[PDB]
């Protein structure tokens, strides 16, 4: 999720 | 003095955006986590791929080492955390209790506790050995971006998109402090300094700040990088010169002089946002990791  | 970080290795293998990289406390290993649901282990000094640890059902946002380098904990969109024995690859416990994505995690210094933060706007404290939730803190009013124990584990710091940093008493769960500056940008990252006096906090207005949390005072600000969108990790580099290290949304690693706040180096090479950086515990080594258009980890070394 961090990467979104 | 300025450092001279130079690219030594590029680590390929994750099949989606990398979310977090962390060096083992014993200096031997680098763990990485990714939107690809995997944890990868790599040699810290040679970048050599060691193994893949798998089991999460959805992407992983964070991973952290136990004090003795034997265990990892990961935080996943599958709403769990998992505790892993590194040498065997075994999932020792799956931590169930958050009601939404688990975004961040850490062991305390005795590595008998784990702290986690979630999109559910809570902070949970877990018993490592039994795997059961000891306390749930109604910490924030938006997703929790970061959670970190202080030097003796008596406090937890958390940060949130709600614009707040909060400091919690580990034993009682009481909110001891709320930190916020003259503006309310989302806070995207926090951690205690190695000596435990300070808190470094990132906000989504292109700013890092060093707080004396005891006094509730902002001592230093670090600017020049780009951070408006993503929860980018930042670090204290203490093996050589005293620096602050962070990723940036312009695809670079930024390094500042901790005391002067001047930019001392920018590291070029990644082809997407540098979401995560970590600093080796004994050598002047930085790991950096980038998002979906890049998918790689890079290892950089400096003479100071």
UniProtKB/Swiss-Prot annotation, chain A:
Allysine found at: 4
List residues modified as N6,N6,N6-trimethyllysine: 4
Tell me where in this chain the PTM Phosphothreonine is found. Answer: 3
Annotated positions of the N6,N6-dimethyllysine modification:
4
Q: Which residues carry this modification: N6-(2-hydroxyisobutyryl)lysine?
A: 4
As for PTM, the annotation reads: Acetylation is generally linked to gene activation.
Please give the residue positions where the record annotates the modification N6-methyllysine.
Answer: 4
Task: Name its cellular compartments.
Answer: Nucleus; Chromosome
Q: Asymmetric dimethylarginine occurs at which residues?
A: 2
Q: Origin, by domain of life?
A: Eukaryota
Q: Which residues carry this modification: N6-acetyllysine?
A: 4
| Family assignment from sequence similarity | Belongs to the histone H3 family.
This molecule's function is given as: Variant histone H3 which replaces conventional H3 in a wide range of nucleosomes in active genes. Constitutes the predominant form of histone H3 in non-dividing cells and is incorporated into chromatin independently of DNA synthesis. Deposited at sites of nucleosomal displacement throughout transcribed genes, suggesting that it represents an epigenetic imprint of transcriptionally active chromatin. Nucleosomes wrap and compact DNA into chromatin, limiting DNA accessibility to the cellular machineries which require DNA as a template.
Subunit structure, as described in the record:
The nucleosome is a histone octamer containing two molecules each of H2A, H2B, H3 and H4 assembled in one H3-H4 heterotetramer and two H2A-H2B heterodimers. The octamer wraps approximately 147 bp of DNA. Interacts with zmynd11; when trimethylated at 'Lys-36' (H3.3K36me3).
For this entry, the protein name equals Histone H3.3
Q: Which organism is it from?
A: Xenopus tropicalis
UniProtKB/Swiss-Prot annotation, chain B:
Q: Name one GO molecular function term.
A: histone binding
From the record heading this protein, give the residue positions of the covalent cross-link Glycyl lysine isopeptide (Lys-Gly) (interchain with G-Cter in SUMO2).
Answer: 16
Specify the effect of residue 233 to A.
Strongly reduced affinity for histone H3. Significant decrease in interaction with KMT2A
Query: Which example biological process does GO assign this protein?
Result: regulation of embryonic development
Q: Which residues carry this modification: N6-acetyllysine?
A: 82
Identify the SMART domains for this entry.
WD40
Annotated site residue numbers, Important for interaction with histone H3: 77, 103, 233, 292
The UniProt entry, under InterPro entries, shows: G-protein_beta_WD-40_rep (IPR020472), WD40/YVTN_repeat-like_dom_sf (IPR015943), WD40_repeat_CS (IPR019775), WD40_repeat_dom_sf (IPR036322), WD40_rpt (IPR001680)
Among CDD domains, the record links this protein to: WD40
Q: Report each WD repeat as a residue range.
A: 13-52, 55-96, 98-138, 139-178, 182-223, 226-266, 269-303
Is Ribosomal protein there in the keyword field? Answer: no
Give the superkingdom in one word. Eukaryota
- Outcome of mutating residue 291 to A: Abolishes histone H3 binding
Annotated keywords? Acetylation, Chromatin regulator, Host-virus interaction, Isopeptide bond, Nucleus, Repeat, Transcription, Transcription regulation, Ubl conjugation, WD repeat
Q: What is the effect of changing residue 103 to L?
A: Strongly reduced affinity for histone H3
Q: Does the keyword Repeat apply?
A: yes
Fill in the subunit field for this protein. Interacts with PAXBP1; the interaction is direct and links a WDR5-containing histone methyltransferase complex to PAX7 and PAX3. Interacts with HCFC1. Component of the ATAC complex, a complex with histone acetyltransferase activity on histones H3 and H4. Component of the SET1 complex, at least composed of the catalytic subunit (SETD1A or SETD1B), WDR5, WDR82, RBBP5, ASH2L/ASH2, CXXC1/CFP1, HCFC1 and DPY30. Core component of several methyltransferase-containing complexes including MLL1/MLL, MLL2/3 (also named ASCOM complex) and MLL4/WBP7.
The UniProt entry, under PANTHER family, shows: WD REPEAT-CONTAINING PROTEIN 5, WD40 REPEAT PROTEIN
Name it.
WD repeat-containing protein 5
